[PDB]
Amino acid sequence: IDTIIEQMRKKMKTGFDFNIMVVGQSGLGKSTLVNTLFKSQVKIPKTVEIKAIGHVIKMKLTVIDTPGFGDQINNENCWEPIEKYINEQYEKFLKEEVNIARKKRIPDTRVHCCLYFISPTGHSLRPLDLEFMKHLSKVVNIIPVIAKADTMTLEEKSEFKQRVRKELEVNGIEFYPQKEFDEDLEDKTENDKIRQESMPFAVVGSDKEYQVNGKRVLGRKTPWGIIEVENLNHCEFALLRDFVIRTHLQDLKEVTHNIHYETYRAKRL
């Protein structure tokens, strides 16, 4: 009997893979948001190693948690461990793609999406964050996210989202969705809304559940009330959730393959 239960836990073939990474200083809620993402589609220690966690939704969703980077006294080249991980998956894929083993289906561990967490300071972006995002954008789709958005009043949040958008433009930071890859009027219309209003996504994370309106929901219980993570009246996690998992999942993979990976392959060959 005990043996019989073991095979059941072993287990689900999937049609495709999607891989998201979270990146930024320690203490910004990255690991919490990883768990939040997983609990939206079904104490946390400091993260000391890059770790990939997968779950079947059929698709295999992998979320890659990372140690804090860009939070030290000296941060020169602090992006290199992340770059190394990303390029390792490109190299893996390159060799799998030649396909000597003649598989029908090729495993894809490449990072299709990188959530870059920005601390909610109210002020101009850190030069370090600008530099970090610049290096990452060369090799992966970057999506800027404002961490711990419950830190901000409504006015502070609007002001800061606008500041971040302006400073990304001024500094020439490539982030997804890139205007360069808008196909038509429908894409330009939807993506302009995303670029100019929705982004950067101001999120709150929690893997704790509370009953609100007689329903179990993800929420953050502060001493002043329960912040409902998936309620758009409370934060923008649901906008981020739907953007990455529903509306632009396929687009993120296509840019990853046809642009970032092809750039890797070009340089490799």
Q: Which residues are annotated as a binding site?
A: 24-31, 47, 148-156, 205, 220
204 binds, among ligand GDP, a copy of itself, Mg ion, none (CB under 5 to 8 A by kind): ligand GDP
User: If we measure between CA atoms, which residue out of 29, 14, 22 comes closest to residue 61?
Assistant: 14
Q: How far separated are the first and last CA of the chain, in Å rounded?
A: 54
Contacts of residue 38, Cβ cutoff 8 Å, sequence gap at least 6: 53, 55, 61, 63, 207
The single residue among 19, 31, 36, 206 that binds Mg ion, judged by CB under 5 A, is 31
The residue count for binding ligand GDP (CB under 6 A) is 20
Binding residues for GTP, by number, are 24-31, 47, 148-156, 205, 220
User: If we measure between CA atoms, which residue out of 159, 110, 116, 152 comes closest to residue 135?
Assistant: 116
Q: Which stretch binds ligand GDP (CB under 6 A): 10-18, 23-31, 52-60, 180-188?
A: 23-31
Nearer to ligand GDP, 46 or 104 (CB): 46
Range 200-239, binding ligand GDP (CB under 6 A) = 204-205, 220
Site membership for a copy of itself, residue 172 (CB under 8 A): no
Are the C-beta atoms of 135 and 84 separated by less than 8 Å?
no
SS3 state of residue 157: helix
Range 39-98, binding ligand GDP (CB under 6 A) = 44, 46-47, 68
At 117, list the tokens: 């967490």
- In the shown chain, the binding pattern of residues 47 to 86 toward Mg ion, with x for contact by CB under 5 A and - for none, equals x---------------------------------------
Q: What's the distance, CA 48 to chain centroid?
A: 18
Task: Tell the smallest beta-carbon distance from residue 122 to a copy of itself (Å).
Answer: 6
Are the C-beta atoms of 120 and 146 separated by less than 8 Å?
yes
Count of beta carbons in the 10 Å neighbourhood of residue 120: 20
